[PDB]
C-alpha cells in the first residue's frame, strides 16, 4: 500500500472542503466541519498563507487522509515549530499507512521550512492517535485550559 | 493599551520592550540561554510583531518589565473563526500574587473580542502550581497528551 499525499494549494478549494468533510465524519462532528465552512476566498487566503499547511491523501476521488497544521515562527529565537491541529484517516482506510505518510510528508515540509520540531496533542481514550504518536514521537502529559474571552476576569 | 497595573501591546517599534519580555521569560522559566542568549535580529522581531497572527503583551511597573504574554492567533480552517493560543506567560517573582497574570489575560480577552476570536487557550505542566491554580480559576481544564516529533528522523 503506497499512499500518495498531496499539499493542498489555494486553487484546490474542493479538495480542501473534502478534507474538512473527512474531519467531521471521523471526529463525529459533522456540523462543526461540514455545515459551517468558510467562503472560497477565506480558504484561498488561508491556503496561500505561509503559516498554514494542509496535507491530504485521496483514493479514487475520496479523501482518505487529512492533516491541518500551523507554522509558529517563535519569538525567543529565529526558529519555527509545526503544530498539527487536526489529523484524520478515513475509517475505510485505517492501518494502511495513511497517517504515517501524511506525517512523513509534513516532515519534508518542516525540513524545507527549517522548522526544528513537529508536535501534536491526543485526547485520552483516542487509542489509535496515541498509538501512532507514541511510535513516532515522545509523549508528555500536560493540561489544557479553555478561556472564554467574553466573560469577566 | 490598558490600565490595570499597566499592560500594553508591544508593537514593531518597541524591540527593547520585546527583548525585556524575552529576558523575563528566561529568568522566570529558569532557562536563560533559550530566551536571552539566542534572541532574533531587530528585523525578525519587528516583522513578527508586525504580523496579525502574533500577540505580545507586557506589564510594566517602572519601565521595568514585570509581566509578559506571547500568543498566536490561529485563523481556523473548518470555519471562519479564530483561536488565540497563549504560548508563554510569566510574572516577575518580585510582583507575584498581585494580579499581574490576571491583568495580562484580561487584556488578552479585549484583544480576542476585538479580533473576533471566540476562544483563548493555554497549556500547563504538572507541578507548575501557580499556572495551574490561575488557569483553573479562569477557564475549563482538560487533560491531554503532548507529543514531540523530530522532522529529521525517518517514519
Amino acid at each position: 500500500s503506497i499512499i500518495a499525499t498531496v499539499k493542498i494549494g489555494p486553487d484546490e478549494i474542493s479538495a480542501m472542503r473534502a478534507v474538512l468533510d473527512l474531519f467531521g465524519k471521523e471526529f463525529e462532528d459533522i456540523p462543526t466541519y461540514s455545515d459551517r465552512q468558510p467562503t472560497n476566498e477565506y480558504l484561498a487566503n488561508l491556503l496561500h498563507s505561509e503559516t498554514f499547511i494542509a496535507l491530504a491523501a485521496f483514493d479514487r476521488g475520496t479523501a482518505i487522509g487529512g492533516l491541518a497544521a500551523y507554522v509558529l515562527p517563535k519569538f525567543e529565537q529565529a526558529r519555527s515549530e509545526i503544530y498539527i491541529y487536526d489529523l484524520a484517516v478515513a475509517s475505510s482506510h485505517r492501518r494502511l499507512g495513511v497517517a504515517t505518510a501524511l506525517i512523513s510528508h509534513l516532515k519534508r515540509v518542516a525540513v524545507e521550512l527549517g522548522a526544528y520540531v513537529i508536535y501534536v496533542q491526543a485526547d485520552y481514550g483516542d487509542d489509535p492517535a496515541v498509538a501512532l504518536y507514541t511510535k513516532l514521537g515522545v509523549r508528555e502529559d500536560v493540561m489544557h485550559f479553555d478561556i472564554d474571552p467574553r466573560t469577566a476576569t
Side-chain angles (χ1 to χ4, degrees), chain A:
Chain A
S1 184
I2 310 173
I3 307 297
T5 55
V6 58
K7 188 174 189 298
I8 297 181
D11 54 284
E12 297 175 301
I13 304 306
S14 287
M16 186 66 218
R17 299 192 183 278
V19 167
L20 295 184
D21 291 339
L22 176 63
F23 285 161
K25 288 170 179 150
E26 297 305 315
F27 299 153
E28 297 180 5
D29 201 342
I30 300 176
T32 299
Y33 288 91
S34 289
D35 295 335
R36 300 180 184 105
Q37 292 185 354
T39 72
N40 289 345
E41 277 201 355
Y42 178 105
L43 284 179
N45 279 316
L46 176 62
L47 291 166
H48 185 54
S49 170
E50 287 291 278
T51 54
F52 180 68
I53 298 165
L55 306 182
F58 289 89
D59 176 32
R60 307 182 188 96
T62 304
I64 64 170
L67 192 158
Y70 295 89
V71 182
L72 311 177
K74 296 309 294 299
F75 43 94
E76 72 285 352
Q77 299 175 34
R79 66 182 178 180
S80 288
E81 305 178 353
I82 307 288
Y83 172 42
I84 302 177
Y85 198 105
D86 280 335
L87 197 173
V89 176
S91 200
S92 63
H93 289 65
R94 298 292 183 86
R95 301 292 269 175
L96 287 181
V98 175
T100 310
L102 291 168
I103 286 174
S104 178
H105 193 158
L106 185 65
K107 287 197 183 182
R108 260 130 52 196
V109 174
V111 164
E112 68 186 23
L113 284 175
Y116 78 102
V117 72
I118 298 170
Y119 49 82
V120 63
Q121 297 135 346
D123 291 312
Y124 286 92
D126 194 342
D127 307 288
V130 174
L132 178 71
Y133 301 146
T134 297
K135 167 110 143 172
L136 300 183
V138 172
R139 171 179 168 178
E140 185 185 13
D141 288 17
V142 292
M143 284 166 292
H144 174 101
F145 300 86
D146 288 336
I147 299 181
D148 194 333
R150 299 171 298 166
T151 62
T153 323

